[PDB]
Amino acid sequence: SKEYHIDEEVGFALPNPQENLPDFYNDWMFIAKHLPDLIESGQLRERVEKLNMLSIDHLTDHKSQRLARLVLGCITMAYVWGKGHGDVRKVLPRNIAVPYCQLSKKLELPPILVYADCVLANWKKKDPNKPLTYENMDVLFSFRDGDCSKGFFLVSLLVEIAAASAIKVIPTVFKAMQMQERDTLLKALLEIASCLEKALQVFHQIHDHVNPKAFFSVLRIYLSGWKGNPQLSDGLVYEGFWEDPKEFAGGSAGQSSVFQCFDVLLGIQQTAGGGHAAQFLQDMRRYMPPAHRNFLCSLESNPSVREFVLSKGDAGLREAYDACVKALVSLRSYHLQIVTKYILIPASQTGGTDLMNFLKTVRSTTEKSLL
Numbered sequence: 001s002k003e004y005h006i007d008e009e010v011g012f013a014l015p016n017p018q019e020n021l022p023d024f025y026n027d028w029m030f031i032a033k034h035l036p037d038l039i040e041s042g043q044l045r046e047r048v049e050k051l052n053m054l055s056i057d058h059l060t061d062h063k064s065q066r067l068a069r070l071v072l073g074c075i076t077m078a079y080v081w082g083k084g085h086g087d088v089r090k091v092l093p094r095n096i097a098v099p100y101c102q103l104s105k106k107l108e109l110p111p112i113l114v115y116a117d118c119v120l121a122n123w124k125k126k127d128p129n130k131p132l133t134y135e136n137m138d139v140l141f142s143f144r145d146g147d148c149s150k151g152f153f154l155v156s157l158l159v160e161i162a163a164a165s166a167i168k169v170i171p172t173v174f175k176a177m178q179m180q181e182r183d184t185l186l187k188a189l190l191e192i193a194s195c196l197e198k199a200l201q202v203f204h205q206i207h208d209h210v211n212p213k214a215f216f217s218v219l220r221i222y223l224s225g226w227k228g229n230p231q232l233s234d235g236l237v238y239e240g241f242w243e244d245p246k247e248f249a250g251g252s253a254g255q256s257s258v259f260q261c262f263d264v265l266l267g268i269q270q271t272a273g274g275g276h277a278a279q280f281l282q283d284m285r286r287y288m289p290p291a292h293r294n295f296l297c298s299l300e301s302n303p304s305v306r307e308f309v310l311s312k313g314d315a316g317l318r319e320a321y322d323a324c325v326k327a328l329v330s331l332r333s334y335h336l337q338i339v340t341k342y343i344l345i346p347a348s349q350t351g352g353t354d355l356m357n358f359l360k361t362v363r364s365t366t367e368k369s370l371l
């Protein structure tokens with residue numbers, strides 16, 4: 001898949017993302033590539049204003065459109081938030097707002113940096129013939145020196161990549177149900193659990209490469225959007241595309257497919273019930289590349305793995321299925337311990353308690369799916 005833009009090695013990540021744009025877009029790339037220096041020094045805004053409007057007709061393929069969305073998205077964060085100390089721009093200059101929106105509408109994504117921009121497309125191998133480890137990778141873009149954006153985006157990415165090993169097993173799960181091959185199904189559920197158990201270890205790198213004070217006080221400010229944000233009460237003006245201001249949520253891993261596809265597969269109904277948690281997760285499918293959205297649809301349309309397992313009186317399938325739910329819980333528990341360290345504690349020196357409660361609701365709903 002192919003039709004679902006899922007790579008066998010990296011899964012939902014864009015494989016081998018492009019680093020360079022056609023020379024026709026060097027004006028864009030000169031800004032995006034030196035944001036630390038241009039923001040700190042005060043030139044970034046003036047430079048986005050002194051930019052000519054450029055067509056998107058010269059972005060041939062998908063890997064190039066995605067790079068451009070990533071260049072334009074980071075530039076728009078830097079323009080809107082400035083040095084990241086509270087001086088806000090509420091108008092995105094038409095000379096950049098129009099191509100960012102035009103390109104966005106092409107990709108059916110919103111004109112704002114989303115998870116698939118700053119994680120899934122925002123990386124590269126150092127030596128392409130070595131393996132995908134932290135030490136052999138880097139990000140393409142950052143916002144400020146010391147904002148810990150490499151460790152944050154890459155460790156999220158390395159977790160996505162570790163989840164890839166399980167994603168490629170989902171076909172065999174539904175096929176084993178169809179063909180009623182109980183042994184094949186059990187082996188597939190235990191292999192899915194095994195890969196999600198391994199993906200926990202990967203999360204541990206977050207402590208080595210991200211510092212709480214930098215993440216809370218700097219990176220978090222540049223990932224923020226303008227949806228129910230008091231600093232832009234009623235959103236951001238995309239000059240020359242909308243006369244009205246438009247609200248768009250900031251980047252969030254609630255735009256991720258890596259856990260959502262296992263929730264869906266296992267019948268953990270994170271999106272049911274009407275609550276705030278399920279509203280957010282459903283609203284956030286809009287900020288997900290369409291092929292990945294479609295993929296979660298296809299999963300939701302398949303016969304329930306949970307129903308199959310429960311209908312069969314089979315302790316071993318029930319344990320294999322609990323092995324996957326448990327592994328999701330372990331990850332979300334580790335994840336909540338990270339949010340305590342990187343947000344709750346730093347803030348005591350979109351609110352802290354609202355975000356922990358969202359994560360707790362998702363965790364509790366994973367917990368409740370065990371047998």
Ligand code: HEM
Nearest residue numbers: 155156159160251252253254256259332338339342355362
């Ligand atoms: C410094 C490290 C991290 C912090 C502070 C952090 C914080 C958060 C917060 C506050 C949310 C709530 C949704 C939102 O506010 O957008 C969230 C959601 C989420 N984050 Fe993280 N995160 C971190 C690392 C990671 C990593 C490395 C991954 C691995 C890919 C990850 C995966 C997720 C997922 C899947 C969700 C959606 C809710 C769920 O499925 O449980 N996060 N994160």
Ligand SMILES: O[C@@H]1CCCC[C@H]1CNc1c(Br)ccc2[nH]ncc12
Nearest residue numbers: 114115118119156220223251252253
């Ligand atoms: O709302 C949260 C407030 C604090 C800054 C992050 C933001 C969540 N956004 C994320 C991005 Br972008 C990339 C990877 C992620 N992993 N987990 C969350 C997450």
